[PDB]
Amino acid sequence: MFNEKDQLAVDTLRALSIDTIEKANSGHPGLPMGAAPMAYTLWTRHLNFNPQSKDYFNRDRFVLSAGHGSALLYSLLHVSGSLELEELKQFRQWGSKTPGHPEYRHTDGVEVTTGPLGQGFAMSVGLALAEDHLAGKFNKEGYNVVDHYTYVLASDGDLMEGISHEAASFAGHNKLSKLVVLYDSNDISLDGELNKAFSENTKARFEAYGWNYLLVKDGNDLEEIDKAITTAKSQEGPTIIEVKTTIGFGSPNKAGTNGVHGAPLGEVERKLTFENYGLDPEKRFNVSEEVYEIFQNTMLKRANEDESQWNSLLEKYAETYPELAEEFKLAISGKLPKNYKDELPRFELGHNGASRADSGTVIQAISKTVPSFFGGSADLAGSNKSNVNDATDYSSETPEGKNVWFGVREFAMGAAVNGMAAHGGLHPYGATFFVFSDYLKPALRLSSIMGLNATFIFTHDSIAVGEDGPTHEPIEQLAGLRAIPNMNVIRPADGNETRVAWEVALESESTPTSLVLTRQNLPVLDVPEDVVEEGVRKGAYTVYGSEETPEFLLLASGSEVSLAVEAAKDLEKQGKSVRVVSMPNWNAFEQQSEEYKESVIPSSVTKRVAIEMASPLGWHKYVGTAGKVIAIDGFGASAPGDLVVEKYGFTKENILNQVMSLE
Amino acid sequence: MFNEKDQLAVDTLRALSIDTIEKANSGHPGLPMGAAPMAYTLWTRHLNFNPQSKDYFNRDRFVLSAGHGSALLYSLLHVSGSLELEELKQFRQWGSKTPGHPEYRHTDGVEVTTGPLGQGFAMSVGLALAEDHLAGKFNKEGYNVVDHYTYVLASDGDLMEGISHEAASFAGHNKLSKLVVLYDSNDISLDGELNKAFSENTKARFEAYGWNYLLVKDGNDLEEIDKAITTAKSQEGPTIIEVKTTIGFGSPNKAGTNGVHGAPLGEVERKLTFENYGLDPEKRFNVSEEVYEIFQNTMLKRANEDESQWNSLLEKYAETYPELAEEFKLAISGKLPKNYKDELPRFELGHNGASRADSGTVIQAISKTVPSFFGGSADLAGSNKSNVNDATDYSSETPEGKNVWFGVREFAMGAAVNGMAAHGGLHPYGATFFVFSDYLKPALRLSSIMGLNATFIFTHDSIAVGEDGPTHEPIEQLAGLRAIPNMNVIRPADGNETRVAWEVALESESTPTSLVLTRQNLPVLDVPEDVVEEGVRKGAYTVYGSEETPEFLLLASGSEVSLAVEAAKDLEKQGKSVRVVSMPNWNAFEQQSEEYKESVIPSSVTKRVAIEMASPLGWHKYVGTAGKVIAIDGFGASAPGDLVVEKYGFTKENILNQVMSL
Numbered sequence A: 001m002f003n004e005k006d007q008l009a010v011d012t013l014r015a016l017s018i019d020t021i022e023k024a025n026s027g028h029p030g031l032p033m034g035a036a037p038m039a040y041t042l043w044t045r046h047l048n049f050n051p052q053s054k055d056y057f058n059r060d061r062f063v064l065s066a067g068h069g070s071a072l073l074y075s076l077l078h079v080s081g082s083l084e085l086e087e088l089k090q091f092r093q094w095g096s097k098t099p100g101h102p103e104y105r106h107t108d109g110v111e112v113t114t115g116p117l118g119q120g121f122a123m124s125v126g127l128a129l130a131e132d133h134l135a136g137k138f139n140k141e142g143y144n145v146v147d148h149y150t151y152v153l154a155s156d157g158d159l160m161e162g163i164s165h166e167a168a169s170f171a172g173h174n175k176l177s178k179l180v181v182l183y184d185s186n187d188i189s190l191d192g193e194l195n196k197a198f199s200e201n202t203k204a205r206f207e208a209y210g211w212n213y214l215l216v217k218d219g220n221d222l223e224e225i226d227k228a229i230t231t232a233k234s235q236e237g238p239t240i241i242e243v244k245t246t247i248g249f250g251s252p253n254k255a256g257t258n259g260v261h262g263a264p265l266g267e268v269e270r271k272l273t274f275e276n277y278g279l280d281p282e283k284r285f286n287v288s289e290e291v292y293e294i295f296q297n298t299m300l301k302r303a304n305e306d307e308s309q310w311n312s313l314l315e316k317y318a319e320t321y322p323e324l325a326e327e328f329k330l331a332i333s334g335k336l337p338k339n340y341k342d343e344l345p346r347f348e349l350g351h352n353g354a355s356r357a358d359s360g361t362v363i364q365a366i367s368k369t370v371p372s373f374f375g376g377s378a379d380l381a382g383s384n385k386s387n388v389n390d391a392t393d394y395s396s397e398t399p400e401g402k403n404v405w406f407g408v409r410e411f412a413m414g415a416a417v418n419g420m421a422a423h424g425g426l427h428p429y430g431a432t433f434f435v436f437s438d439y440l441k442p443a444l445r446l447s448s449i450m451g452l453n454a455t456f457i458f459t460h461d462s463i464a465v466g467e468d469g470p471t472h473e474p475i476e477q478l479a480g481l482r483a484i485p486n487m488n489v490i491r492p493a494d495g496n497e498t499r500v501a502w503e504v505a506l507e508s509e510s511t512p513t514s515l516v517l518t519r520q521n522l523p524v525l526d527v528p529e530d531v532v533e534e535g536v537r538k539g540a541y542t543v544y545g546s547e548e549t550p551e552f553l554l555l556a557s558g559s560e561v562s563l564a565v566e567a568a569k570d571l572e573k574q575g576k577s578v579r580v581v582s583m584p585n586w587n588a589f590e591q592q593s594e595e596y597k598e599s600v601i602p603s604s605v606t607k608r609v610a611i612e613m614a615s616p617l618g619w620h621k622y623v624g625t626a627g628k629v630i631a632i633d634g635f636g637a638s639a640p641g642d643l644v645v646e647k648y649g650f651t652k653e654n655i656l657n658q659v660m661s662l663e
Numbered sequence B: 001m002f003n004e005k006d007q008l009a010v011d012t013l014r015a016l017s018i019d020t021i022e023k024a025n026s027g028h029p030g031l032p033m034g035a036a037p038m039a040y041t042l043w044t045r046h047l048n049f050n051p052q053s054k055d056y057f058n059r060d061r062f063v064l065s066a067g068h069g070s071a072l073l074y075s076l077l078h079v080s081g082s083l084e085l086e087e088l089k090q091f092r093q094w095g096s097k098t099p100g101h102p103e104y105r106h107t108d109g110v111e112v113t114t115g116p117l118g119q120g121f122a123m124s125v126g127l128a129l130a131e132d133h134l135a136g137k138f139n140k141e142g143y144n145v146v147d148h149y150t151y152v153l154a155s156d157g158d159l160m161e162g163i164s165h166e167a168a169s170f171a172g173h174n175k176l177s178k179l180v181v182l183y184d185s186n187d188i189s190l191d192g193e194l195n196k197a198f199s200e201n202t203k204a205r206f207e208a209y210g211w212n213y214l215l216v217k218d219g220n221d222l223e224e225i226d227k228a229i230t231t232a233k234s235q236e237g238p239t240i241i242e243v244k245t246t247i248g249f250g251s252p253n254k255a256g257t258n259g260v261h262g263a264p265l266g267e268v269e270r271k272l273t274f275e276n277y278g279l280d281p282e283k284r285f286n287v288s289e290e291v292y293e294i295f296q297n298t299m300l301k302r303a304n305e306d307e308s309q310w311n312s313l314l315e316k317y318a319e320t321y322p323e324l325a326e327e328f329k330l331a332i333s334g335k336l337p338k339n340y341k342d343e344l345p346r347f348e349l350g351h352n353g354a355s356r357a358d359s360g361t362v363i364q365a366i367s368k369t370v371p372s373f374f375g376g377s378a379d380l381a382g383s384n385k386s387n388v389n390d391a392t393d394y395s396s397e398t399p400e401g402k403n404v405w406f407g408v409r410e411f412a413m414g415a416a417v418n419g420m421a422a423h424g425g426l427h428p429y430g431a432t433f434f435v436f437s438d439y440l441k442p443a444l445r446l447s448s449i450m451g452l453n454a455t456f457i458f459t460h461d462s463i464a465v466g467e468d469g470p471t472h473e474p475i476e477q478l479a480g481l482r483a484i485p486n487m488n489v490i491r492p493a494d495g496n497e498t499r500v501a502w503e504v505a506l507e508s509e510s511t512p513t514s515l516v517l518t519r520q521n522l523p524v525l526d527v528p529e530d531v532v533e534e535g536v537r538k539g540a541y542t543v544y545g546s547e548e549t550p551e552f553l554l555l556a557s558g559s560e561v562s563l564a565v566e567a568a569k570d571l572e573k574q575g576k577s578v579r580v581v582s583m584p585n586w587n588a589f590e591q592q593s594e595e596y597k598e599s600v601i602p603s604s605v606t607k608r609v610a611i612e613m614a615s616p617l618g619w620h621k622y623v624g625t626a627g628k629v630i631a632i633d634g635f636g637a638s639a640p641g642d643l644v645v646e647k648y649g650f651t652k653e654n655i656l657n658q659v660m661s662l
């Protein structure tokens, strides 16, 4: 079913990609040269996607995990009627809609921001996860309201990365059938031939994960690829197709070598490659009207008709199942139920609750009030208290279940939460220990680059963890996460603060949120509720004292705020003026006005002291030149948590000694 | 042959672990109880290890990747004579040599610190890699001076982690035949049963990696395990042995559950369990002298004879290959050849070079002069310029090769560098892009906790990468690394700074070093070489000016130092006093005398300003309440690198405008 016109379209894509890279004198020709046939077959024969109707909720989700092949994607998006030839001509240039690695929200049709290898694949696992769960919740007899595939195009670097192993295990265990991977196997990487570091059977590996495997012997044979995709679509497990291609196909002097991977060909080699393709070298950025026409008559019309039929089905779904239809529209919009906050827990004085336990209570409330809430833990739900006890577990037999068992796969869990957030219809969260945030720190960065409403529960935040030792006690993680732009790192001081931090995490549509929680019982603070909501939303607020300019201004976060307050009292009892300020979220505080910033932390107070059970880094911004920081400068210790905390300076008397000794 | 005395030994190990966890009211009984037979078989019958002579270089290296089974290890170390019973009676207590997870250098005979899952397994891969490379370099005919095995005890969680996939791929591709993994397959995890998140075929997976597979069906059958280990030692690839064990075996009511995984048994269940073991529930911390005798007659005698033969073989080695034996001993001592730095590159005024290129020049000198240098890149050696051009690539056929090809395996690479540092005899190094330093951050943390002389080459450090875009352009990595205790993060300003940075990196016997290098060309500065060598070592030094208190103190790291210098000059000819300061390593500067710190960054100068193409976080410590931080509080952009740098404010004119606005 493939003609010479189809080959003309394929080689047009290749020529376009390399003219783009040639103009920029920057880019990666190899993968776009080698993958153009399978990408063409996918887009024109299967993919239900219109890059113009970029938000069709039942659209197939295609992800290019190999971000360095961005040109190909852009070329595709141009011949499908969403991206101009001028943006291609402005490749890797300032302000362009065609950045070097594909970016979400910047280019229409780019579903997730890719580049860092393996992450696109795991985010695609997350997208398919969201698909299965939403279908399990909403679909009825003859009302397949959620039914679409998840396609990903990956390279050798993707499968050399362990996050691929983690995500593929999770996908095969839960039988995510609508996930299809197209693996460009070119036996070449950046530094040379793949047989220098890689030698393994993708077949046996992925069949051991529970996957289906298909081998395409010639990546240029469009028919073999088409059959592989169709079979993969009719199968019960996740499926990977190892399309065997030659990197830099068409180039005589640079094919099958590392040189074509990430360096421009040059006009000489581009000329010879064009000769091999049967295209005019002298004409640049040329696309035949037949090429545009083919995409118009195949993918675009098919996607339009799928969207139209889905809209009709939904109009009937609203009549037969009205409540579900309203809830589904609210889910797609990402809006939260009105007055959901009104059912969130109120903690009263005399309560001594760990931030993880109070988070668990709030989560019990959120699963009831917000039907889009979805997530789980990395085999630490007993320790993270991230389970909904009134809900079932997600599985192949129970796709509607609202608790996910990610397993000891934290990086993949983060990328999966990111893919779920990119999919839409869900409010996703993932849980682990704060000290193991380091495992998924790349995912977090992508979440902050894309601006995903993903929430990351991190418990066990300090040396108060205790007996589990320095490997399990965080010191430097808060500062690293605070350094990530657009990252809400909220460390609540008590249960009420935890509730408001959850509210921030749910309503933050453009900002990912890490919740840094504790395992030790924290004291509930006598700050009225009004002030807590406002102050957690503004990052830092006064919890004790009325004098804007005092002798002593004590800054604290999380487990320390109560301690700070205690110290304040003693200072007051010896004729010293003092104010105690909680700083749950530094990001929110730096978003506020200079007036509020100087009302909470006047730079006029020279004796400013901060107290945190973490690294000092970043605190001298808020204490000044003549202020002091009481923190942890080394690693932790294996001993009961109270003892470790006391030995590391965080006792009221040592704070008093430090504060009174200062100037 | 296995007597009932061997069974008494195994059950004494179990009882001792249970009692330690009971007294601490903290810890994990499950892995001790279930894997005591296999640990006993390996330690008493195969392991050439004396915990008392913990530094015997040809010892068999054992790693417990399942740190939560700490008690078991401690019990072994107590029956082997290295650890006192009174230490086990202080499990997870302040100042004890028995912390909750195994800690290297804090307890005798713990080869690496574990607890974080998968990292012990990958560090074991790195240990075996060091073994093979040292054997390829030093072993001669009849002089097998490096010939020992690397064993690792691992759990289900170690294999769900992707670092395991990476490291096992590396080990199967490179035929690390002397690596044996014992996999505790209890089909149970912390949150519950393994069938709720995990369903793989370990045999198919690891045989796809290029590994050998063995299945021990009865985890309590010591002879099955003995035969498994003998066969694993005889095979030509890395071997995993799946040992099917019941988690918390011997407990009537808690066995086969996730509850016995991380909670003390309780005294009631303890009594019932001791009855199943045939032990007296009244006696606590009771080891029969038969068990001590078994471990004395087996592992200790054999390990000491092994070491005696090794010492004699080294004495003969020194006669037959003197120079090579002296180099072997210097490598074991962890020392550097004297006057090595004399052969290191010198860059002069008018040199414009990227930190990766001058790095590579230095590296090409180091490998020639420092014979213990070893490392490679994660498929970026062409970019990082970490390749030793005069040398061969490491492989199964050429284990003497000094260039390692890790592939796209950053976390496994950092863990392998750490294992090499632990092994001894190597000066291991790693290389990738700074932005992907996050892929190996957990390994960096353990490098810092353990105090390993590891060196991590991080190139492409700023928004000057350019067209690759925001996901490949570092912003916040510098700050997250600088917060890691015991981590030397060095950002050289020119190539001379890069040479001194490499010297510090190699001479840092107890602190790991991360080198942050630039893709774009940096100009060489007019500071004299002595000032560079002193200042990079002291972490901060003045590169421009003479007045201790000027009107303006410019602070910078790397690419912007020169920028600051130029700005200073213009500032000067608008009638101001300026001093420009380079801060390549904060860890070194904080380590100095306050007198020096005030001489370089005085608190008396109100108008202090920092210029660094990274996050602001951490810089207000040095610019004070009234200073300014010119940095980046957002992500990067895909465009020609110079254009990104200029659009992000890092031109001389924007610095002058903001500085005179202050």
Ligand SMILES: Cc1ncc(C[n+]2csc(CCOP(=O)(O)OP(=O)(O)O)c2C)c(N)n1
Residues within 6 Å of the ligand: A030, A031, A066, A068, A115, A116, A117, A118, A155, A156, A157, A158, A184, A186, A188, A189, A190, A191, A247, A261, B378, B379, B380, B408, B436, B439
């Ligand atoms: C985690 C990560 N490490 C490193 C890189 C840099 N990088 C981009 S492409 C590449 C080569 C990997 O080869 P492959 O993906 O097989 O490329 P192909 O030949 O198909 O173009 C590398 C190291 C990256 N993007 N992400």
Ligand SMILES: Cc1ncc(C[n+]2csc(CCOP(=O)(O)OP(=O)(O)O)c2C)c(N)n1
Residues within 6 Å of the ligand: A379, A380, A408, A436, A439, B028, B030, B031, B066, B068, B115, B116, B117, B155, B156, B157, B158, B184, B186, B188, B189, B190, B191, B247, B261
């Ligand atoms: C990276 C990381 N994530 C989580 C933990 C904590 N944790 C969760 S499950 C688990 C046990 C994994 O081994 P498993 O096979 O479940 O152990 P067993 O049943 O033999 O005790 C650990 C240590 C950890 N130590 N490191």
Ligand SMILES: [Mg+2]
Residues within 6 Å of the ligand: A155, A156, A157, A184, A185, A186, A187, A188, A189
């Ligand atoms: Mg490849």
Ligand SMILES: [Mg+2]
Residues within 6 Å of the ligand: B155, B156, B157, B184, B185, B186, B187, B188, B189
């Ligand atoms: Mg287990």
